[PDB]
Amino acid sequence: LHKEPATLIKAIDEDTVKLMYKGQPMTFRLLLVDTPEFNEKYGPEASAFTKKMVENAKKIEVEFDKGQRTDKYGRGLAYIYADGKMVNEALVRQGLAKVAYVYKGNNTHEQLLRKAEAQAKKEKLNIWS
């Protein structure tokens, strides 16, 4: 897999973000995660955490997997990195997301995120509390 440049346009919500990628505005949906909605418990905190992570980054990168790169809504499907730290993994590690939406061929970092979820769960963090 390869990391590619992008720039923040706007944080959106818990697990989507609007990035400029190859010069074009796109909404990205984070691979391999599911989050609470804004009006559910831990939704605001997921949203805030994603927002902070992307807004505070000096370098955003986009890493596509081996499979589908856009979903049925036109959202890009990637692993997103903020100063080298994976946002998808960070949300899971903090118990603000669960591993989810694991489709075959777009699952290179599954076991990495499952490990993260396991540690968040052990720690009883947030959604696991």
Ligand SMILES: Cc1cn([C@H]2C[C@H](OP(=O)(O)O)[C@@H](COP(=O)(O)O)O2)c(=O)[nH]c1=O
């Ligand atoms: C994360 C992800 C979501 N999706 C689709 C499946 C879900 O369809 P439905 O809308 O029909 O449920 C939806 C969940 O996204 P959200 O969790 O952002 O709603 O996005 C993919 O197709 N591939 C993916 O990798």
Ligand SMILES: [Ca+2]
């Ligand atoms: Ca949502």
